Structure 1
Amino acid sequence: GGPSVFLFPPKPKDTLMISRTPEVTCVVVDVSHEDPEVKFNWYVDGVEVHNAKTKPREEQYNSTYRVVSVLTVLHQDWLNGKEYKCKVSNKALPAPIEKTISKAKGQPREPQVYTLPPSREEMTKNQVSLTCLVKGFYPSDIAVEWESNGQPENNYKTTPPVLDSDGSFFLYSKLTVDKSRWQQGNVFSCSVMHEALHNHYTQKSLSLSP
């Protein structure tokens, strides 16, 4: 029938750290050998731009060609809602294919970050759960990590964002540590990246209070 276009956003962390390079990815699949030519046009807010890096086509094991084009986006443009259009032209199509993407839309809402110590009843266990509540944020793109003086604490798991009853999102992150480390008074820190925080970052700390 005709080829199909997919347009993918940057990775969320790449949009929240100015040191990183967010990029948007236009993928064309189902390109026939009969008309194998593929032209990309990129627009930012309706204005054609020219810095996209297209990859040379690559044949698939199902006898179709796959062509990829990558446009780097500016940290501030993406956060300011600019919209990115990929236009794919190929002989086999009646009219060119237009896909548009941007950051999740909606008024931004800054998260409230709260650490919760292990439950009393959980103090019987050889491991305990440190809880980071992140609530009230909009949009849902977010990243959460845990640290203890310098090094990342990676035995943690974070729930997906959940739509709350006021239209904002919340989640929880659970860090599991040896009960000894928690009682040795060590400081544990939940750090949160989200667009609506100052510099898109905050951290909150948790320690035994005796």
Structure 2
Amino acid sequence: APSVFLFPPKPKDTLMISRTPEVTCVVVDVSHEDPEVKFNWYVDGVEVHNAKTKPREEQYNSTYRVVSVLTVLHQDWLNGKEYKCKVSNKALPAPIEKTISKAKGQPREPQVYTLPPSRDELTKNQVSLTCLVKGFYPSDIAVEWESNGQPENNYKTTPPVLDSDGSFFLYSKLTVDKSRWQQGNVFSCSVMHEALHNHYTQKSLSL
């Protein structure tokens, strides 16, 4: 019998007016015997009609996969609207329902702090530039690094972690050739979040 997965928009998508945030309702394990899928969409319990439902794609395990995509208003998502996908199939005793929304709670502003490498790490060929991002809510967030207006690609960011006050934190780690750090180049940690002014801040780091 069929299964349903509801996917939220990307954090970046909801924070920038230029981007297009979407909610996606994927349905898997639809059979040949009853292959028709109907989708119904609701926003805060109210039906909407603007969703674009893709034609169904057969898969290698001889089950059908069908996707539906609802485009979402930036402010609706940020204002906490609930997005419901109702999925109907003649193989299902009742239509499956999933709901998704922005995590509930008062948004909190990220504190962004850049940390230089430890003295001890200077023995090595490469060094670690650390960006601590703390006290934010909800956990939806995007983090990036750049230098001299151009993007630094050798970095990893930890997932968000629930702190003891109910807020979230994370760390991002940029790895650069020691030489570059020594020369005095400026490195910048960019952070995108709803509780930031213009949904964006950045903090710089150098010696």
TM-score normalised by the chain length of structure 2: 0.94
Gapped runs of 5+ residues in structure 1? none
Q: CA deviation at 1:164?
A: 1.2
Tell me how far apart the structure 2 counterparts of residues 11 and 28 of structure 1 sit (CA, whole Å). 20
Q: CA deviation at 1:201?
A: 0.9
Q: CA deviation at 1:207?
A: 1.4
Residue 123 of structure 1: SS of its match in structure 2?
A: helix
Equivalenced residue count is 207
Q: CA deviation at 1:51?
A: 1.0
Q: CA deviation at 1:187?
A: 1.0
Question: Larger deviation: 27-36 or 184-193?
Answer: 27-36
Q: CA deviation at 1:16?
A: 2.1
Tell me how far apart the structure 2 counterparts of residues 37 and 179 of structure 1 sit (CA, whole Å). 59
Tell me how far apart the structure 2 counterparts of residues 176 and 111 of structure 1 sit (CA, whole Å). 23
Tell me how far apart the structure 2 counterparts of residues 126 and 36 of structure 1 sit (CA, whole Å). 58
Deviating beyond 6 angstroms after TM superposition, the runs of 4 or more aligned structure 1 residues are none
Residue 191 of structure 2: SS of its match in structure 1?
A: strand
Residue 170 of structure 1: SS of its match in structure 2?
A: strand
Gapped runs of 5+ residues in structure 2? none
Tell me how far apart the structure 2 counterparts of residues 36 and 128 of structure 1 sit (CA, whole Å). 55
Q: CA deviation at 1:33?
A: 1.9
Q: CA deviation at 1:32?
A: 2.0
Residue 39 of structure 2: SS of its match in structure 1?
A: strand
Question: Larger deviation: 25-34 or 81-90?
Answer: 25-34
Tell me how far apart the structure 1 counterparts of residues 97 and 160 of structure 2 sit (CA, whole Å). 30
Q: CA deviation at 1:134?
A: 0.6
Q: Aligned-pair RMSD on alpha carbons?
A: 1.3
Tell me how far apart the structure 1 counterparts of residues 80 and 100 of structure 2 sit (CA, whole Å). 10
Residue 84 of structure 2: SS of its match in structure 1?
A: strand
Deviation per residue, 1:72-104 (Å, 9 max, x gap): 111111111111111111222222221111112
Q: CA deviation at 1:58?
A: 1.6
Tell me how far apart the structure 1 counterparts of residues 4 and 56 of structure 2 sit (CA, whole Å). 14
Tell me how far apart the structure 1 counterparts of residues 60 and 156 of structure 2 sit (CA, whole Å). 37
Q: CA deviation at 1:57?
A: 1.2
Match of 1:174 in 2: 173
Residue 76 of structure 1: SS of its match in structure 2?
A: helix
Deviation per residue, 1:87-124 (Å, 9 max, x gap): 11122222222111111222211110001112122222
Tell me how far apart the structure 1 counterparts of residues 120 and 4 of structure 2 sit (CA, whole Å). 53
Tell me how far apart the structure 2 counterparts of residues 73 and 148 of structure 1 sit (CA, whole Å). 33
Residue 132 of structure 1: SS of its match in structure 2?
A: strand
